[PDB]
Amino acid sequence: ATPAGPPPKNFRLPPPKNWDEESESTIDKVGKYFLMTEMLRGMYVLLEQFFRPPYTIYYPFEKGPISPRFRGEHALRRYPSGEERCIACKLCEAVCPAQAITIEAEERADGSRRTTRYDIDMTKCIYCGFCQESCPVDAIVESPNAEYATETREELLYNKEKLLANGDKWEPELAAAIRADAPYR
């Protein structure tokens, strides 16, 4: 048990106190017993909570606070010209810890290295952000969006058509989050 070496000073407890050694008055001890004193204090503490402002917010009219680093649903992003930023390096497919990303690429009609397939199984994803961490060109990002609950699981299998549409819709926040969070990356 205790450390080797000299035993801790005063580690041995003092000898037990007898009933007639407890220095509490009978009037106090009996009063506390019969008057339920300590539990009246607890009742009172609830009373002053009753007259304190509540903590509650009125979701969805009010929303709790989220940061620029918040990790929500995925979106594929474009350059200011409308060209896709994704170049099919496959780094995010490799680093994924849950194997939720499946990518197929080719040379495009104009000789460009672009994806032909881009799927995220949103029921396999763990929402860690490792895929946006690894992107060389800021293509895959996680939006600040958390409200995208669906009726079926097929609605959670995102193809490139769904992910580009997400970036096309959410670009103003995705840009404002990257702006606010880039220097720390």
Ligand X SMILES: CCCCCCCCCCCCCCCCCC(=O)OC[C@H](COP(=O)(O)OCCN)OC(=O)CCCCCCCCCCCCCCCCC
CA–CA separation, 91 vs 130, rounded Å? 10
Place of tokens 């397939």: 117
- Tally of CB atoms within 10 A around 76: 24
Number of residues that bind ligand X (CB under 6 A): 5
**Cα gap 23→19, rounded to integer Å:** 9
Is there a contact between 85 and 138 (Cβ–Cβ < 8 Å)?
A: yes
Task: For ligand X, give the closer residue by CB, 5 or 16.
Answer: 16
**Residue 63 interaction partner, one of ligand X, ligand SF4, other proteins, none, beta carbon < 5-8 Å per kind:** other proteins
User: What is the spatial distance between Cα 37 and Cα 32, in angstroms, rounded to a whole number?
Assistant: 5
Q: Assess contact for 76 and 167: CB atoms under 8 A.
A: yes
Q: Least distance in Å: CB of 172 to ligand SF4?
A: 20
Q: Which of 40, 102, 159, 169 binds other proteins (CB under 8 A)?
A: 40
The verdict on 103 binding other proteins (CB under 8 A) reads no
How far apart CA 52 and CA 27 sit, in angstroms, is 36
Q: Which of 128, 157, 165, 175 binds ligand SF4 (CB under 6 A)?
A: 128
Burial of 177 (0-12, 13-18, 19+ CB in 10 A): buried
Contact between 34 and ligand X by CB under 6 A: the answer reads yes
**Per CB under 6 A, 129 contacts ligand SF4:** yes
Kindly state the smallest distance separating residue 99's Cβ from other proteins, in Å: 7
**Known binding residues for [4Fe-4S] cluster:** 86, 89, 92, 96, 125, 128, 131, 135
Q: Which residues are near ligand SF4 by CB under 6 A?
A: 86-92, 96-98, 100-101, 103, 120, 125-131, 134-135, 137, 139-140
Q: Which residues are near ligand X by CB under 6 A?
A: 30, 33-36
